[PDB]
Every structure is written in C-alpha cells, then in structure tokens.
Amino acid sequence: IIYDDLSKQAVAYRQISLLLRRPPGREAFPGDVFYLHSRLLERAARVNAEYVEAFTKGEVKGKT
Amino acid sequence: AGAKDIRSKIASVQNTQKITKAMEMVAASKMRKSQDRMAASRPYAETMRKVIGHLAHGNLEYKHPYLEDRDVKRVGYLVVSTDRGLAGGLNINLFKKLLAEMKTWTDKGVQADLAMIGSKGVSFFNSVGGNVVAQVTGMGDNPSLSELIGPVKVMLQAYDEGRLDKLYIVSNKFINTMSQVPTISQLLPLPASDDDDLKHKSWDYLYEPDPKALLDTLLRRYVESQVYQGVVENLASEQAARMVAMKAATDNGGSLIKELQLVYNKARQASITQELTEIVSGAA
Amino acid sequence: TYHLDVVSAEQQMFSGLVEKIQVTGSEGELGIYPGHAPLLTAIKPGMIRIVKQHGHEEFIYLSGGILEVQPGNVTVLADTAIRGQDLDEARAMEAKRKAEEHISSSHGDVDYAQASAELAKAIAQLRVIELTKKAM
Amino acid sequence: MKKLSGGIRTALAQYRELAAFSQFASDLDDATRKQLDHGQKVTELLKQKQYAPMSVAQQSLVLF
Amino acid sequence: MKKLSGGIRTALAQYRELAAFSQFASDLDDATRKQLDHGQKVTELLKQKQYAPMSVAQQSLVLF
Amino acid sequence: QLDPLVVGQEHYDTARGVQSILQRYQELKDIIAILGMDELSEEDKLVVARARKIQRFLSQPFFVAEVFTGSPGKYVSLKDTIRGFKGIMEGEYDHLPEQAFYMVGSIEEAVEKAKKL
Amino acid sequence: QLDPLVVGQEHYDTARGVQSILQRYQELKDIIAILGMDELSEEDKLVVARARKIQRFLSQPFFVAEVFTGSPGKYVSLKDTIRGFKGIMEGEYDHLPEQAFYMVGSIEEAVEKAKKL
Questions:
Q1: Which residues of chain B lie closer than 8 angstroms to E23, CB-CB?
Q2: Which residues form the signal peptide (chains F, G) (predicted)?
Q3: Fold of the B60-205 domain
Q4: From CA B133, how far away is CA B135, in angstroms rounded?
C-alpha cells in the first residue's frame, strides 16, 4: 500500500479539526497528529500463521 | 533573527567549515611536495661550497671582493614573501623583524635597498615606503632558478659596483612541521665556514683556464643557489603555516556552530510559544 | 669505473657508475677516464657523452655548468638556463622595469584562487557576532 | 536624469556583486579592482547633508 | 543481492564526500584518484529510466 | 514538460547545453575575479565569451515595454530560438561582438546589428 | 541635539567619526572570529586597534561607584573629551597600549597611566 502524501492528510486533518474548535498544538496541528499517523502505519505488519488460522477460522493454515 | 535566518547562517558556517577543511588537506599535501623539492636542492650547494672552500682558504687564497669585509655604507636585502594569503602571521613577523634591523642600520646612517621575491612583500613595502629596487613575482608553487637570476643579478652587480657593502637574505626557515622562524642571514661577504685548510694539502686542481676566472663564477652561482634554497624553504614554510591556520579556522567555525544552535533553539521555542498562545487566547 | 653525478640547483639529473665521459670543456673538448687527476673547468652548452658500465652510451644536454674531477668522484654542476653577461643583463633590466612600473603577475594557483573565493563569499555579511551575544 | 541614472544602477549592481571581496581586496586582479573601487566612489557620492536639497541641474551634473 | 551489494552504500557515501573535497583540490593522490573514478562509474550505473523495472537477475548481473 | 519524449531531442539538448554553459560560467567568474582573465585556458576563454553571448541573447525587447524604452518589440518563433542558441553554442558566431546580441530579438538581427556597431 | 547647528561642527564631526570607526569594527568581528586577526588588511588592523582604544576610553570612574572599585571618581568636561577622541582618531596616541585608556579621566591621565604600564 502506498499513501501518496501523508503530508496532505495531516493538513486535511488540521483543517477538519480547527473547524470543530479542538485546541491546536505545535505548528497548529491538532493535539494528536502523531496518533493519526501512528495508528495508520501500525497496521502495516507481518502476521504469523496462528493469527491467520485463528482469524480465518481454520480455512488457511500454513500461510503468513 | 527568527529561526529561519539563523538556520541560513548555520548552513553558511557549516559550508565555511567544509571549505577550510579542504584547504587544510590541500596544504598538507603541498607541504610534503615542497619539502621534497627542498631536499633535492642540497647536493649542488654543498659540493659547490666545498669547492669554494678549497679555492678560498686552501693552501692558496685570493683577494676576491666577495670574501672580505669593508666599511658598511649601505646594505642590500633580498626579501622572500609568499604569493598567497591565509598563511597566518608568516609574512608580518618577517617584515617586522626586517623593519627592526633596517631601522638599526638607518640609525647608523647607512641606507638600505630591497629586492623582492613574491608579491605580498611587494605590496607591503610599497605601502610602507621602503626602497624596492627590483622584484620578481608570481612564481607560485613552481619556483625556478631562471626567474631568480634577475634580482640577484641586480644586487650582485650593485655589490661589485661598490654600491652595496653587505647583502642579506631574509626568509623563513622550515625547522619543523609545527614551527617556522624568520631568519635574516648574511650571504655577502661570504660567512666563515666550519672548514680547515689542513685537509687541502692532499691534492690540488688543474685549473682551466685559471683559478681567478673560475672563482668568480663559482661565487655567483653559489649566491644564486642560496637565494633559490631560501625561496624553496619559504614555500614549504608557507604550506605548513597555511595548514595550521586552516586547522585553527575550522575549529573556530565548529565552536561557533554550537553558539548559533543555542540561538536557533531559543528562537524556535519562542516562536512555537507565541503562535500557540495567540491561537488559544483568541478563542472565545 | 667511477661514480658520476650530474646535478643542478633544482634537481639531480644523473647518478651512477661510469667508464668514461666526454665533455666539451670551456677551453676545449675533454674526456675523463677513471683515476683522472683533479681538475676544475667550466663547460660550454651542449651534449655530453656518458658510457655507463657495460658500455651503454648515452647523451645528455647541458646548458652550461662547471666540471669538478676528484680522485674518485666527478660531478657536473649543470645550470638550468643559458648563462652569460648578454642574457643575465636582459633578465636584470626586466627585473628593474617591473619594480619601476609596478607590474605584479598573478600566481598560477587556480585551486587556491577558487577556495579563497568560496571562502570570501561564504564569510560575507554573516553578522554572526551580533547575533550570538559573544562579547568581543 | 533618466539618461544619467541608468549608469548608476549598473555601477552599484556590479559593486554589490563584487562587494564580498572587499575584505580580500588585496589579492584581487586590477580588472575587477577598478569596478570595486568605482562602486565605492559612486556610493560615497550619494551621501548628503540634511536640509540641503539639490535642484535637478546639480544632481544631473554630479551624476554626470 | 545481499552478497553482491553489501559494499555499495558506504562506498557511495564516502565517494560523495570525497568528490566534494576534490573541487578545491587538483593534484590528487592517485590512490584517491582510483576511488573517485570508481565511485563515478557506479554512480553512473545506478541511474535508471522511469518505467523500466529490472528483475533481480538483471540487477545482480549489473552489480556483479 | 522539459524531457525529450515531448519536446524532441533537439530542443532538450539545446536547453541542457545552454544551462551547462551558464553553469560553467558561474564557476569561472570567481577565477576571473582573482587570477584575472589571462590565466584561463584557450578553451575556457571560449566558454566565457560564449556564455556572455548566450546571456545577452536571452534578453528581448517586448512590444508592451516600448513605452519604457522606445525600442520596438520583437516576436521570436521557437525555431529561431533553438537555431540561434544552438548556433551560438557551436562557435558559428564567434566573430561577432557581445553587444551585437543585446535586446536583439531574433538571431538574424544580431548579424544586422553587428554591422552597425 | 546632535546637530552641527546645535553642538558645532567639531563636536558633531568627532561623534560621527567615532560611530564610523566602531561600526567598521563591528563588521570585522566575524572574519576575525573565523580566520583570526592576521588576514586583515594592513589598515584594518589599525582600525581594530583604534576601535579598541576608543572602547576603552569611553570608560570612566564615577564618584558613586567608588564603593565598588575603590578608584576615585573623575569629572571630564566636554571641551576635554572631544579633544581626546579627536586625538585618538587622528592617530596621535597609536604608541600607547590599550590598557593605558581603561578607566581614566581626560586623555592626559591616559598618557600618564602608560608610563606606569
């Protein structure tokens, strides 16, 4: 997966935040801009075979 | 001020530090080459001085002018200077020593004449008003004996023409890579060598045509060789001084980056605080 | 054989062992074989013949110089350019003219000329000492 | 004034382009030394005392 | 690729600082002349056209 | 858009050649300042003269600027632009003076202006 | 009040010359800091020496600051200070050391303090 600009997602989040009056932080980005990208990129993971088998209820067993 | 101007200034000082490091390395290589070209000069002057010793104080001796003193009515100086700056105090220590001794001699009421090797001394002694009678300039790091023949010819011609009574070469001495010292040393009339006539009786030369004509050219070639050796030593000394001066300048730049960064951090923090306060205090 | 040197104010030109040499001495052609008695003469500009041991003839061009022969050694003190009252005087007259009319030649160092200029430009209007409150 | 002032912009422009060398001016070549010492004179020329205004004839004469 | 390429990265970092030193220095030691003239080849080798990807065989052959 | 696949190799090579000559003249300026010009090679003095000509030739008299300077305007087609610059960079005009190229519009008007200088 | 029409041409001109020297000295501090003092032109070293002498001579011992330094206070009249600064600027005290000027009254007390180092 390729995020074409996470720079212009931070800007869009700053916009949609200030319009809700939420208090800003450094460089006027919202308080939790770090959390915005953190909880996104932490989904990029390699997942071991038991998680796959448990999620997929046994339909796939050998794979990661 | 404001974080951006200071970040620009820090960029430019880092660039200055790169440049002076490069010049340090360049001078550090040219110094080794210069002190090699310095060693290749010794044999000629050493053997020619042995020959002059034989013809001067061997079992016979001659009345040649260059070998015995007379009344000092005026003095000549051959001044070696660098062609390039950024060498630190090299040139000015030398010129100050020269000026002191020229003042001594002019107190005794004897004039002095200057012949210049290198353009820095030319400009200096023009601005100070000394008597510059001949010059050669722009040799750079390719000194060649064929370009020194001019000024030393002038000074020798004026010596045997009776218009000079003593002749000096003023130049730096590449003692060691960390230390160079300006020296004013006499080369006419000829210094009394650490030699003994006792060894001479073993043999003598078949002079063709005759010794009185040979001794003249020997002494002229010897003086030329010593001016050339002084020039090459001054060049090696220049390279060493530029190396150490650029070392000092690179450390001075590095120690200034760390002040500018304190200023920059303080301004960064100040701008964040002011902006965020102007937002939060405008709401409601 | 004997040990020959040909040297100049600037650099050496030959060293090694030789059988004979032939030199156009100032007063006449001349040839040195081993054991030659001590001798001292000027030489004219021109070639000299070395025959290195095993007989490898060679030629070198000398612009002048002085020849010294000794019991064992012989050394030729060459010089780097033609010499004489005719030419040294032209050199001296130019050396005077350039001091009378203040003619300064540029050095040849392009490397220094570049580094000096980059340093001058980088160090310009830097105003750093106003900015950090360094007393000075 | 339009005719004469056109040379002052260029004098001072070349001066601003060479001004960085003023501190190493001794090593400079005599070709650029003349521009560097011309810019200084046309700069020293533009100095003026207070309450002493110049008619256009005087300004044109001096800039000429 | 791990075997044939472990050296490239530091070679290029050092080449790119050396090639900066070289602008002020003519008269280069031949041992560093070798280093510059090699780093320059390899830098010239790594540039590539836009839409032309290479399979690992074609990359490994070139790096060899 | 400045890449060969769109502007052709002719235009692209002319543009990059001009940028390279001007970039080299930037280097040589600071040697000319210190060592004087005669310390330049015979080839480098050629880069200098051609960079100065190229730098004059980029200027142009506009039709709307006539009110500022009285000079009539000139419209220069792209063929003339590429042809003129590509000629200058190849030594075709090494015999004209620099000022022949200043505010001259098309290249054929530089040869006309050189006759009058 | 610093106008020629208010303080006279000589007072005004001395003050402007002092500002000029100290400003030229500020401009040199960055090159002095990077490259050291030996790269200065032979007349910029003189500017630096006179600027430091002027910086010292601007100092004065106050009568209310005896408690801090012991040294007794001094009163310097205007006629007596423009003379001293005109002297330092014109070069007629270049032979004294810097410390000869620190914390003195008029210029005569500096000329004296130099005897005692």
A1: 22
A2: none
A3: Pyruvate Kinase; Chain: A, domain 1 (3.40.1380)
A4: 7
